[PDB]
Structures are given as structure tokens and as C-alpha cells.
Structure 1
Amino acid sequence: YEIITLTSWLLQQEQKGIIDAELTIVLSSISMACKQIASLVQRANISNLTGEDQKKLDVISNEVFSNCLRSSGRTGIIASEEEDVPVAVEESYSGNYIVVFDPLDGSSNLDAAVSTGSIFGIYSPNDECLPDFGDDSDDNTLGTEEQRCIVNVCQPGSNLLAAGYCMYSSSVIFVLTIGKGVFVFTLDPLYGEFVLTQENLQIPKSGKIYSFNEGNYKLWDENLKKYIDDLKEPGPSGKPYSARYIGSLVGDFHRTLLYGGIYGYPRDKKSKNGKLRLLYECAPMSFIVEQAGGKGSDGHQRVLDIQPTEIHQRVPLYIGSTEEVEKVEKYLA
């Protein structure tokens, strides 16, 4: 009616029977973990007084997540293979839900200069993957067997129930979809609560803005190079495409969601299969974009049609406005 907080909104969806009380608690706990991580990000410079500065924050953030979700279930960590961010996987005691949580969107200080964010996906599994806990088991680290079970149990195309992200920038924004549209919540610094600021967000069908790291231009295929060249051609009013690339996956994606356009992390000569991980990053983002009326593709097929088969599977990503993604797909055919 006037002020709708995340708590009130979740309780309303529950009354409507859209989600159950258990999921209401999981989603509410995730947002609480995000409030704390936001604070960690804002004070990082200060905390470091009394560059692996972004790599240590990944770890502390995963511990904050674990503590906030201790009443729903146990949490394990899928260790970083390369320069990847370690992923937190929480499995409910009841066996009804599994939350795959990406604490921050990167491990680079440069890419986190102005923004960063958390990404999560909630699945409804058939199995129990995580074992028990430990007395002096300091390492939460999941083993080859447990990492395998999670990859097999979490299926983007058939059991992803909810997805969202929380952006930490000049504003702290919580974006969520429980299967019926995208909802945007803004954190009120004053009262420490997420306030509903946008319902049923729709990403524009088109937008003359492209987000790619053009420093890798000579490492791309001739397909992609021509697409990139043609965007620089002043079409109509004699106005070419605008280029914007923060380097922050959440920041670039959020801007694409609000103003339209296309974001891309293609494959190149060094990263033959791209860089973004299919299960941890691309799946949740693609589900969200599709709920907002957009498209998430790997250049040829729909990302959500790809079944994860490897622990750290990577894939190229073209996401954003439908007409823009369709345009890049025509050049890559």
C-alpha cells in the first residue's frame, strides 16, 4: 500500500500459497546475509588498516552466509579451481531446498572498484549430497564426490525454483524472482530494511548499448569481430551504440536489466570455453533475464537448455534484450 518491505512481500506470497514458510525463511535469511556483506564491502578499506584484498572478502562473506542460514541447513564450500570465487552450497535439513550461493562476483580488486554483488539460485533436489558436520572440522570444503552430487542434483532447466542477486554499489539492490516476474528491492540505509521499489520489471526488447571487454578483440573469432564492428556504424540519427563495461558481472548485468542492451563474455583464444561458470553464474542470471522478458544465450543455444555435466563447467554468455541477443546469434551462425 505504501511501504512494502521484503519481509511483508514474502509473507504475502506465502499467504497466496506461491511459496511455503520454509522458503520464506531461506529467502529472508539470504537477504540478511546480504545486508551484512554490504557492510563488509563498504568498510573494506578501514578493516584492512587494523592485491588479495578481494580474495579474502570472498571467504568472510561465505562464513556470513553459513551463519545466517544455520537454522535452515548445513553449508559446504566448493573450493576455487582457478581465479574463481569459492561457492557456498547450503542444503536444508529437511531435504527440500539447496541454495547455491556465489558470495561476490569476482576475485579482482580492479573489477570491484565501484561495484560487486552476490548471486544465488534455489533448487528442489532429489538427493542428499552433504554429509554431517564436525567437531574440529575447520574445513567445510566439499570433496570430489560431494561436488559431483550437487552438479547432478542442481538442474537449471527442471528444478531451479528461485534466483536473484544483491548488488553492492552506490545503492544496495536486491533482485529476486520466484517464478512469476522480477522484483527489485532497495535497501534503506536508515532503517536497515529492503523496500520494494519495482514490481514485474521488464527488460527493454532493444537497446543500443553493448557491454564487452574490447581489449580482447584480437582474440575473438572473425564472427564476433564483425558484429562488434557493425555496432560502431552510426545507423539512424547518426548515433552509434554506446559502450559501457564496468568489469563487475552483477553491475554490468543490472544496468543491462534496467536500461536494455547486450552484455557478453565470449570465448577467445585463451579461454576456449569462456570464463563464466554455467551452474554458479550463468544459470541464475539467465533465469532472471527470462523472467524479465529477455534472453540468455551461449551464442547458439538457450543457456537454460544446457545441462551441467562438469564441476566447473564454463560457457560463453550473451545476455540482455531479446532483439540484441538475437542479433549476435545471427552473426555467430
Structure 2
Amino acid sequence: EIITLTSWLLQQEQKGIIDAELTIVLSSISMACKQIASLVQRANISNLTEDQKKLDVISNEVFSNCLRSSGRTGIIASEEEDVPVAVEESYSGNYIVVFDPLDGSSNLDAAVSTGSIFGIYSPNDENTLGTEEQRCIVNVCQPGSNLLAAGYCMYSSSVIFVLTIGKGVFVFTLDPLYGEFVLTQENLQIPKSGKIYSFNEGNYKLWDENLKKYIDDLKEPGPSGKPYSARYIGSLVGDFHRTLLYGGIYGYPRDKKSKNGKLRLLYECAPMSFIVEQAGGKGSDGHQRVLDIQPTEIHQRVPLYIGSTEEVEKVEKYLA
């Protein structure tokens, strides 16, 4: 009947899919998410005695404490208006965890939802982090080949923990009563196609003529007489989640103001892409597969078109 994250994790290890060390890591990350989820809910009251960013920091500390049993954790400072990234390195040096505490620094975008994003890499042979460490992490963490697991935790009307250890996507819902994550969905599959596009059309006049065209053909009441549906929360995790469940396409293209997209490759795009690919979808930068793009910079950015396989291929068409 009821399967908790812990039960589910131990079974996997019993099957030898993951080792105790990784079971502890994944368990600790979720522990952190249970606490971050609570900070988010009481944030208004907390403030009685702007706030979104101050929350990023607090969330990274909770993360560090929860993983003190597995390894030390440094921090990659937000270059720009970004969220500071916490990087944990196992004392064993067998696992590294890149953790994105909250999905945004804006209060507007976190009005109804937000979430954490994480990825786990395994080094081969080769508190703020310095330039000598940053360049090192960047080289050590390659999403394409050494990314073992990834997931996110959505904090919205419900707290969802999504995870993939390389063999499918599992969804665990947090039970408010018992403070535990219960498996509510196995091997999640994102629909092949969906009549839903998730873009910020406020920037329509900043997009390339390629994209303006794609965007325009969506508004054309198709075969039936029903045009695509537009949905854009502003929250990467929230918008991504809805795309994962109901299908469609999400996109954060490059514009006049942002010549190379806003979403960071290693911290946000890579985990989301690995997950979607396990859910049977596609994650592209417009012309190519996100995972193959090897990070050369610390806060490297890239355009994102992620979601249903047919929907993404469609946009790729207008952009070639």
C-alpha cells in the first residue's frame, strides 16, 4: 500500500541500484526539503519579526547541516541576480551534490510556488568557493556523462519531491500529517504532445523572428477550433512540473536583453533535462540536446525548450 521515500530507497539499495552512501545522501536532501518547505510557508510571519532572496541563504544552511554526515558543503555566490548555489562534496569524494535552494530570487515569481533543484555527480579521478574551486567543480561536474541522479522539490499548494536515479521518474507527495514523503506515482511519463505552451509573451518584441513565428502559429485555432493554451506561473519548478504532468512545452529563449538565455546550464537546465528525458520527453537549447553541452563557465547560461517530445521538435523546426 503506502510507500515512503525511505522504504523506496532501501528497496533500491537492496536491488543494488544504489549504495547505502547514496541512500543516505538522497535521504538527507529530502530532509532539507522538509525544512525549506516550512520556511517558505511561514515566511510572512517570519518577516514580522525582498524576503525571497534572504530565504535562499537560509535554505542553503539547512541543506549544509543535513548533509554534514555525508560531506562538506561550500557555496557558489550569485554572480548576478541569481540564487546562491550550495555544492556538497562527500568526505568520500564519491558523490557531489549541486543544490539550488529555491528556484528564484523574485517575490513576484514565488507568489504561489517555488522549489529546490538538485543534481548528483560522481567524480572520475580528477565557505564561499574560490575561483580555483569554481573552475574545478565546473570541470568535475559534467551533466552529460557523470550525472547519476537528479530531482527537485516543489513547494506549492502541495509539496512534491521528484526523483530519478537513472531508471525512471518517481513522484513522492509530502503527507502533512506524518511529515513523510509518500510515493504517489511510479515511472511518470510526460505526454508525447500537449496543446499548452509556457512562455513569457511580455518579451515577444525582444525575440527573434524565428520565435515570433512559432509563437504566432500556436495561436491559430487548429483542426478543431481550439488554439493552444497559455500557462506561465513564473516559477521554473512550478511551470516545469505542470509540463511534466500534463504535457506541453516550456521555454526560456534568448532575447535582445539576454543574448544567451537566463537559466544556468549546470544548476537549473541540466537536472530538469535529465528528469524530462527519463519521463520520455526532450530538453533542448533550440538546436541541440542540453546534456551534451559541456559547461565551460561557472554561471553559464543557455536557452531552454523542454517538455513533450513532439512539442519541442516543433519549436526546433521554426528555429533551425
Measured against the shorter chain, the TM-score band is: over 0.9
Deviation at 1:40, TM superposition (A): 0.2
Q: Kindly tell me: are residues 83 and 127 of structure 1, through their superposed partners in 2, closer, same or farther at Cα, counting changes over 3 Å?
A: farther
Task: Extract structure 1 runs of 4+ deviating beyond 4 A.
Answer: none
- Is the Cα contact below 8 Å between 1:282 and 1:303 reproduced in 2? yes
1:221-243 CA-to-partner distances (Å, cap 9, x unmatched) read 00000000000000021000000
Structure 1 stretches lacking a partner, 5+ long: 129-139
Deviation at 1:174, TM superposition (A): 0.1
Aligned-partner Cα distance in 1 for 2:120–2:261: 24
Aligned-partner Cα distance in 2 for 1:150–1:127: 13
- Equivalent pairs counted in the alignment come to 320
Aligned-partner Cα distance in 2 for 1:64–1:127: 30
Aligned-partner Cα distance in 2 for 1:279–1:149: 13
Deviation at 1:126, TM superposition (A): 2.7
Deviation at 1:63, TM superposition (A): 0.1
- Is the Cα contact below 8 Å between 1:74 and 1:90 reproduced in 2? yes
1:248-299 CA-to-partner distances (Å, cap 9, x unmatched) read 0000000000000000000000100000000000000000000000000000
SS at match of 1:101: strand
> What is residue 81 of structure 1 aligned with on the other side?
79
SS at match of 1:187: strand
Structure 2 stretches lacking a partner, 5+ long: none
Aligned-partner Cα distance in 1 for 2:132–2:299: 14
Equivalent runs, 1:134-145 vs 2, <5 Å? 140-145=127-132
Aligned-partner Cα distance in 2 for 1:282–1:244: 20
**Match among 240, 248, 267 for residue 280 of structure 1:** 267
SS at match of 1:196: strand
1:28-71 CA-to-partner distances (Å, cap 9, x unmatched) read 00000000000000000000001x21010000000000000000
1:144-176 CA-to-partner distances (Å, cap 9, x unmatched) read 110010000000111000000000000000000
SS at match of 1:110: coil
> What is residue 15 of structure 2 aligned with on the other side?
16
> What is residue 54 of structure 2 aligned with on the other side?
56
Aligned-partner Cα distance in 2 for 1:172–1:312: 28
- Is the Cα contact below 8 Å between 1:185 and 1:196 reproduced in 2? yes
SS at match of 1:25: helix
Aligned-partner Cα distance in 2 for 1:253–1:157: 20
SS at match of 2:268: helix
Aligned-partner Cα distance in 1 for 2:287–2:179: 43
SS at match of 2:78: coil
1:292-324 CA-to-partner distances (Å, cap 9, x unmatched) read 000000000000110000111100000000000
Aligned-partner Cα distance in 2 for 1:127–1:59: 31
The answer as to 2:143 corresponding to 1:156 is: yes
Q: Kindly tell me: are residues 268 and 293 of structure 1, through their superposed partners in 2, closer, same or farther at Cα, counting changes over 3 Å?
A: same
> What is residue 244 of structure 2 aligned with on the other side?
257
- Is the Cα contact below 8 Å between 1:227 and 1:331 reproduced in 2? yes
The answer as to 2:215 corresponding to 1:215 is: no
Aligned-partner Cα distance in 2 for 1:299–1:62: 32
Aligned-partner Cα distance in 2 for 1:122–1:187: 22
- Is the Cα contact below 8 Å between 1:319 and 1:325 reproduced in 2? yes
Aligned-partner Cα distance in 2 for 1:310–1:38: 31
Equivalent runs, 1:106-125 vs 2, <5 Å? 106-125=104-123
Deviation at 1:213, TM superposition (A): 0.3
Aligned-partner Cα distance in 1 for 2:164–2:298: 25
Deviation at 1:127, TM superposition (A): 5.2
SS at match of 1:290: helix
- TM (normalized to structure 1)? 0.96
Deviation at 1:186, TM superposition (A): 0.1
Aligned-partner Cα distance in 1 for 2:133–2:105: 24
Percent identity over the alignment?
100
Aligned-partner Cα distance in 2 for 1:127–1:256: 37
SS at match of 2:109: helix
The answer as to 2:65 corresponding to 1:67 is: yes
Aligned-partner Cα distance in 2 for 1:292–1:311: 28
Aligned-partner Cα distance in 1 for 2:124–2:145: 12
Aligned-partner Cα distance in 2 for 1:292–1:226: 28
SS at match of 1:112: coil
- Is the Cα contact below 8 Å between 1:127 and 1:153 reproduced in 2? no
Aligned-partner Cα distance in 1 for 2:111–2:145: 36
- TM (normalized to structure 2)? 0.99
Aligned-partner Cα distance in 1 for 2:199–2:20: 41
Aligned-partner Cα distance in 2 for 1:278–1:127: 23
- Is the Cα contact below 8 Å between 1:95 and 1:127 reproduced in 2? no
Deviation at 1:215, TM superposition (A): 0.2
> What is residue 28 of structure 2 aligned with on the other side?
29
Aligned-partner Cα distance in 2 for 1:91–1:106: 24
Aligned-partner Cα distance in 2 for 1:104–1:271: 22
